[PDB]
Design a protein around this ligand. Structure first.
Ligand SMILES: O=c1ccn([C@@H]2O[C@H](COP(=O)(O)OP(=O)(O)O)[C@@H](O)[C@H]2O)c(=O)[nH]1
Ligand SMILES: *[C@@H]1O[C@H](CO)[C@@H](O)[C@H](O)[C@H]1NC(C)=O
Ligand SMILES: *[C@@H]1O[C@H](CO)[C@@H](O)[C@H](O)[C@H]1NC(C)=O
Ligand SMILES: O=C(O)CCC(=O)C(=O)O
Ligand SMILES: [Fe+2]
Ligand SMILES: [Mn+2]
Lengths: 706, 568, 19
């Protein structure tokens, strides 16, 4: 029945790092009484775990212990403060200590770090660990007083070997009742026992379990090269994310931009490389962000001569928008690492940047509030969650292989599909991030972060950030955007973007398909029935029309007109037209895909009970000119129904007429640029073409389901 | 509802159905949805007979036989698991789940046709745990069992530190496990059980297309934890054979399972409503099979005779001289003389009456072997266990030894190696054979007529030792040179099989361990009785010492003795 | 793949009786 108030927590930490804050949060979760030593004092040691060290905490605790040299009734425990996260309540800890009944319990470890020779001197242990680790201990104040009063060495002396030598004395160990926790009852060192720990969820809290010994530890000390694994473990224990209650320390600690002052200055950046499709859309989208232009400093670094005309066209609009606008053209012959590094240094040497916000070329931000929410988060580093459409490829990583390469974690499939929501600790981010300026200034002062080795610049950047001890958070609470596909982007066309129908269908539809199509499909009117069994619904936007006529005029070869044919297997056209079939241009497969995806459902909803697979063999674009060819004679079409789409605006470019249904006395006189005509053409509908008078007109015709 | 899918299970069905019949659950509250398909044997007929006989005892029986085809065209053999077979089995399991749902039946137990559910209370015990999915832990001759404690990411076995502590029942308890298979209960009364399916894989299912993995994913997506319970010893199952294995290998594996049952339990009695196939014992091509047994021992005698009839091994019972019942005048009339200076190396005794009786029993067997001119004879002690395929593997080895010729005298088949060091030299061109070193546990060996003649010509009666001290002397492998110095003819060509086929039934210190050889009085006097000193019994089992660096890699192994699936 | 998860869920309530 030990009272909880007799236990005092003692930790040492020179500075205040994010790890120390995490430990403080974990300790405060179970109302622990923590006293910190060496707060602000210089680290008179050296490398934390490279070869040796730890000779200053002993001196500090020897100076501290003089106040409690006689407090027998008090129980004191010491522990690291940078890679330790508490998990259990004090009551169970003191209960376990009472059950052990020793005077000083040390955390046991698997290997002998400082020396190897003294291994045989250790008393034998059945199943658990045998050696001693200096990661912490629990003991009476008099006992620790006696054991550590004997310290008289240099401040740079190693620590664990002194404890090992003191423990190895048999008589003193018997007198001091020194014991080791071999079966992981209190302390669990993640080094060497990575496979003996599993996460045991609960309702409103989380814990860890040692499967090998079937016990629940209280303190975990992820020492050694296990920073990644303990950092992963810190996402849940003890209040990270439980199924009942969402996220924990994920909603508080927000700036909320109060005061009405001009919002903190932002140094935007753009790195257009590996030529990115749909560039003009992103350049246009660069303006409509929800942040005042006077507080936005742009830096557009190009690396492609191919994309030079687009940036040149867009440049004046940006120049009028932002307070400061700069360009670095492709002629500088600058590798991406240099670009990122001098952008980083340009902000780093300008005290007026407070959040250096990179944004790569292939990251479309469909949410216009990304900057506001991310800045409100006030994380040291933070990235938004973007994933390819209908895949698993995201912009972060779960865990790193021993080769420092992409492995697969366990929760990654959860996080990519938003089954879990919060702000997650992550060992690699890219393609969009928000870094705090102070971290740039007094935390990353060296210049060479992206260059300096053979590794990729991004991996080098995250590796540099990992060793310095800086967290790389990541949030996916809302929806932020999607990553484009630049695996293959041919550029041997006037508008090579038109071939991107397979690669990025959603943005292709957004740019190209007429904006009124979806509303018409879901059934709020729009579609018209000028004559029975005839329908008028808009399909294409103006960009499709103008880029298509541009491509076809680039080809230029206007074959057709003769009553015979070689493109036809039969070799005898019922009626000839001057036409360019999609087969010779190489665009036919994309057109069949478009018919399959964006026309089929329209016809199925328009004609109930009809089922289609959208097969088309003959598809072409016909030009009507008053001098080349007149309109067609009355005839019939060799297909179930015919899709008829105009390609240029009537009046502004040409004057004429549309279709003429003989059996119904129907005349179509005003074709629209972005609309399509659907009508059966086998039996019921005898149609004739009206003659063009002035100008030149283009019409797209296809025969589906022959 | 008790379900059962059976294919080519005719060797196993008689004992398994009797075990199901012995379950203490009211048959008017049970059912049956037994289906059988793609049978190459008479399984459908045996099952039809049983179901016809038991039909009036159960609430209902739904029978869906398909006698043809006997195989799929995409199958390479009876043990090949093709995708078409996996798909069909998944469809069958889905249909069984549907049948279970339509009668609103309380729970479904999918018993596999090769699972021996020997504990009659298995159902009541599993029901009392009140779990949505719970499997009885089934025991097997290996680390194999009906559950996995771990999976990496593709659904393959992943060794975990929990498996061995669970497998040995050092930790008893219902344990969360990522997979249970073969035998498991689903509670259909629990609401969450409605979303489980085996036929349509989950839309998000992206793992290997395998019937046990797909169901585990469905369980995972439904948030249904599959618990495994090992609180009791529920029963036994055979180990999955290799793909190129025959139906005979499967039948022999199941027979070995029944033999292992018979090691610690009364025999699993077959159903009285099912016939039993006639066995035709043979002597496996040996000239004689001897069985040494103490007249006072009958439990072991009966067990061994049943085990031999099980393996179709003909044997001649050989009686034995009870040296403990022997008086001095009988020993003297036989001319039995102890080797001068003989002292048991572990305790400090001259000998026991039991060791004398054993020695004289072997001497009498060797004499009969010589008098009859028996070219090859097998000698058994009564507390042996069989390796898998024992008879066929031993007959193949002996046929290879004879065909390739060998002047062998005492090829050891089962022993305790006492010299634990560098490997022994493999005999060239003879597979699975090594030169024998110093050995304890002379439980059984084959001897040739030449060896028996040499042993009789050694005149061993004037220099009596225990058989396990005499034999290493006779092959010049005895470590004590003084004992060899007591003898002159040391020309036994002794070899040993590497994969021993026989082990003790009980080791020293095992529960039920009794030694009629060690617990005997001293040859002389009657007040010097030696009790078994639990502290002094030493050679309990020469196997834990063996997990050392004895190599043994270089012996030509036989294709036999191959088993396990991805759970070992 | 480090630290395999143990996501438990409370059992579902019993289904309503038939009629
Ligand atoms: O900037 C500092 C100042 C002090 N320490 C101390 O270094 C000791 C060991 O470092 P860590 O536990 O981080 O490494 P390990 O040696 O356990 O792998 C701990 O007591 C910390 O208080 C540190 O890591 N970083
Ligand atoms: C907090 O913990 C203290 C000591 O650790 C204990 O005495 C007290 O009951 C706890 N109070 C709360 C808020 O639960
Ligand atoms: C789409 O339809 C709406 C309906 O009100 C109209 O306002 C808009 O101009 C249409 N878009 C076009 C014609 O591009
Ligand atoms: O060119 C064709 O034959 C089809 C076009 C046609 O007749 C029409 O536009 O109605
Ligand atoms: Fe037409
Ligand atoms: Mn540490």
């Amino acid at each position: 029945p030990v009272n909880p108030e007799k236990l005092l927590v003692i930790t040492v930490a020179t500075a205040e790092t994010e790890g120390y804050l995490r430990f403080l949060r974990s300790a405060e979760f179970f109302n622990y009484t923590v006293r910190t030593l060496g707060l602000g004092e210089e680290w008179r040691g050296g490398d934390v775990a490279r070869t040796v060290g730890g000779g200053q905490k002993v001196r500090w605790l020897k100076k501290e212990m003089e106040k409690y040299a006689d407090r027998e009734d008090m129980i004191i425990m010491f522990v690291d403060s940078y890679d330790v996260i508490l998990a259990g309540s004090p009551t169970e800890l003191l209960k376990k200590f009472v059950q052990s009944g020793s005077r000083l319990l040390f955390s046991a470890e698997s290997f002998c770090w400082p020396e190897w020779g003294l291994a045989e001197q250790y008393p034998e242990v059945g199943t658990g660990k045998r050696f001693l680790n200096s990661g912490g201990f629990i003991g009476f104040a008099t006992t620790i007083h006696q054991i550590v009063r004997q310290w008289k060495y240099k401040d740079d002396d190693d620590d664990q070997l002194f404890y090992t030598r003191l423990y190895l004395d048999p008589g003193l160990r018997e007198k001091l009742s020194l014991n080791l926790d071999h079966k992981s009852r209190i302390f669990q060192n993640l080094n060497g026992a990575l496979d003996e720990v599993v996460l045991k969820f609960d309702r409103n809290r989380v814990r860890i379990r040692n499967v090998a010994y079937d016990t629940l530890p209280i303190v975990v000390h992820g020492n050694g090269p296990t920073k990644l694994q303990l950092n992963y473990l810190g996402n849940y224990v003890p209040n990270g994310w439980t199924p009942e209650g969402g996220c924990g320390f994920c909603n508080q600690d927000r700036r909320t931009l109060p005061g009405g002052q001009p919002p903190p200055r932002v140094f935007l950046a753009v790195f257009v490389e590996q030529p990115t499709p749909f560039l003009p859309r992103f350049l246009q989208r660069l303006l409509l962000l929800d942040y005042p232009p006077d507080r936005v400093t742009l830096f557009l670094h190009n690396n492609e001569v191919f994309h030079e005309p687009h940036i040149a066209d867009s440049w004046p609009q940006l120049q009028d928008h932002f307070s400061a606008v700069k360009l670095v053209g492709p002629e500088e012959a600058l590798s991406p690492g240099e670009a990122r590094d001098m952008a980083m240094d340009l902000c780093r040497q300008d005290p007026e940047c407070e959040f250096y916000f990179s944004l790569d070329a292939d990251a479309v931000l469909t949410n216009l509030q990304t900057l506001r929410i991310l800045i409100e988060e006030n994380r040291k580093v933070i990235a938004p969650m973007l994933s390819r459409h209908g895949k698993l490829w995201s912009n972060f990583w779960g865990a790193l292989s021993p080769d420092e390469y992409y492995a697969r974690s366990e929760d990654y499939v959860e996080l990519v599909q938003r089954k879990r929501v919060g702000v997650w600790n992550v060992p690699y981010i890219s393609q969009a991030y928000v870094i705090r300026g102070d971290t740039l200034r007094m935390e990353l002062p060296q210049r060479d972060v992206f260059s300096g080795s053979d590794t990729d610049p991004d991996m080098a950047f995250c590796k540099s950030f990992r060793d310095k001890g800086i967290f790389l958070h990541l949030s996916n609470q809302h929806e932020f955007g999607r990553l484009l596909a630049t695996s293959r982007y041919d550029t041997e066309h006037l508008h090579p973007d038109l071939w991107q129908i397979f690669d990025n269908p959603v943005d292709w539809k957004e740019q190209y398909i007429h904006e009124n199509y979806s509303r018409a499909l879901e059934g709020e009117g729009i579609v018209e029935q000028p004559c029975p069994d005839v329908y008028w619904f808009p399909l294409l936007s103006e960009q499709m029309c103008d880029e298509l006529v541009a491509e076809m005029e680039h080809y230029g070869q206007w074959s057709g007109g003769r009553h015979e044919d070689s493109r036809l297997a039969g070799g005898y056209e019922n009626v000839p037209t001057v036409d360019i079939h999609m087969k010779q241009v190489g665009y036919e497969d994309q057109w069949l895909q478009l018919l399959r995806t964006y026309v089929g459902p329209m016809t199925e909803s328009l004609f109930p009970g009809y089922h289609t697979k959208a097969r088309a063999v003959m598809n072409f674009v016909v030009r009507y000119r008053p001098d080349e060819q007149p309109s067609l004679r009355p005839h019939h079409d060799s297909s179930t129904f015919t899709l008829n789409v105009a390609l240029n605006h009537k009046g502004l470019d040409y004057e004429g007429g549309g279709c003429r249904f003989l059996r119904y006395d129907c005349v179509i006189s005003s074709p629209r640029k972005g609309w399509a005509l659907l009508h059966p053409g086998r039996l019921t509908h005898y149609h004739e073409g009206l003659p063009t008078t002035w100008g030149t007109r283009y019409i797209m015709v296809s025969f589906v389901d022959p | 509802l008790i379900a059962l899918l059976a294919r080519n299970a005719a060797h196993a069905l008689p004992t398994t159905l009797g075990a199901l019949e012995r379950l203490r659950h009211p048959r008017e509250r049970t059912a049956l949805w037994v289906a059988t398909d793609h049978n190459m044997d008479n399984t459908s007929t045996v099952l039809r007979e049983w179901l016809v006989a038991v039909k009036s005892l159960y609430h209902s029986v739904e029978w869906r036989p398909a006698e043809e085809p006997r195989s799929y065209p995409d199958e390479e053999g009876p043990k090949h698991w093709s995708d078409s077979r996996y798909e069909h089995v998944m469809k069958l399991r889905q249909a069984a789940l549907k049948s279970a749902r339509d009668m609103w039946a309380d729970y479904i137990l999918f018993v596999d046709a090769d699972n021996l559910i020997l504990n009659p209370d298995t159902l009541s015990l599993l029901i009392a745990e009140n779990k949505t999915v719970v499997a009885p832990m089934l025991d097997s001759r290996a680390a194999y069992s009906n559950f996995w404690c771990g999976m990496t990411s593709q659904g393959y076995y992943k060794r975990t530190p929990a498996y061995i502590p669970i497998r040995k029942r050092d930790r008893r308890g219902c344990f969360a496990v990522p997979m249970v298979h073969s035998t498991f209960l689903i509670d259909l009364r629990k609401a969450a059980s409605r979303n489980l399916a085996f036929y349509p894989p989950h839309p998000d299912y992206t793992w290997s297309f395998d019937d046990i993995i797909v169901f585990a994913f469905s369980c995972k997506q439904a948030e249904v934890q599959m618990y495994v319970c090992n609180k009791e010893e529920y029963g036994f199952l055979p180990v999955p054979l290799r793909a190129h294995s025959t139906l005979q290998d499967e039948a022999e594996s199941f027979m070995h399972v029944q033999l292992e049952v018979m090691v610690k339990h009364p025999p699993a009695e077959p159903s009285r409503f099912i016939s039993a196939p006639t066995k035709t014992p043979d002597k496996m091509g040996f000239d004689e099979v001897f069985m040494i047994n103490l007249r006072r021992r009958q439990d072991r005698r009966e067990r061994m005779l049943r085990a031999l009839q099980a393996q179709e091994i003909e044997c001649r019972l050989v009686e034995a001289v009870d040296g403990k019942a022997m008086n001095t005048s009988q020993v003297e009339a036989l001319g039995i003389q102890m080797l001068p200076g003989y002292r048991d190396p572990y305790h400090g005794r001259p000998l026991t009456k039991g060791e004398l009786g054993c020695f004289l029993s072997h001497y009498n067997i060797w004499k009969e072997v010589v008098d009859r001119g028996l070219q090859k004879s097998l000698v058994f002690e009564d507390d042996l266990r069989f390796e898998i395929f024992f008879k066929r593997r031993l007959m193949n080895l002996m046929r290879d030894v004879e065909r390739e010729g060998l002047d062998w005298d005492l090829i050891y088949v089962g022993r305790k190696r006492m010299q634990v060091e560098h490997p022994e030299k493999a005999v060239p061109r003879v597979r699975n054979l090594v030169e024998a070193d110093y050995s304890y546990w002379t439980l059984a060996y084959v001897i040739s007529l030449q060896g028996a003649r040499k042993l009789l010509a050694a005149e061993p009666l004037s220099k009596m030792l225990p058989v396990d001290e005499f034999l290493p002397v006779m092959f010049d492998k005895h470590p004590v040179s003084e004992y060899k110095a007591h003898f002159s003819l040391r020309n036994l060509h002794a070899f040993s099989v590497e994969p021993l086929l026989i082990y003790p039934t009980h080791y020293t210190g095992d529960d039920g361990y009794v030694s009629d050889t060690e617990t005997s009085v001293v040859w002389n006097n009657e007040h010097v009785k030696t009790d078994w000193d639990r502290a002094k019994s030493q050679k309990m089992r020469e196997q834990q010492a063996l997990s050392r660096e004895a190599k043994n890699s270089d012996v030509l192994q036989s294709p036999l003795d191959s088993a396990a699936r991805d759970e070992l | 793949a480090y630290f395999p998860e143990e996501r438990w869920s409370p059992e579902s309530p019993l289904q309503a009786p038939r009629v």
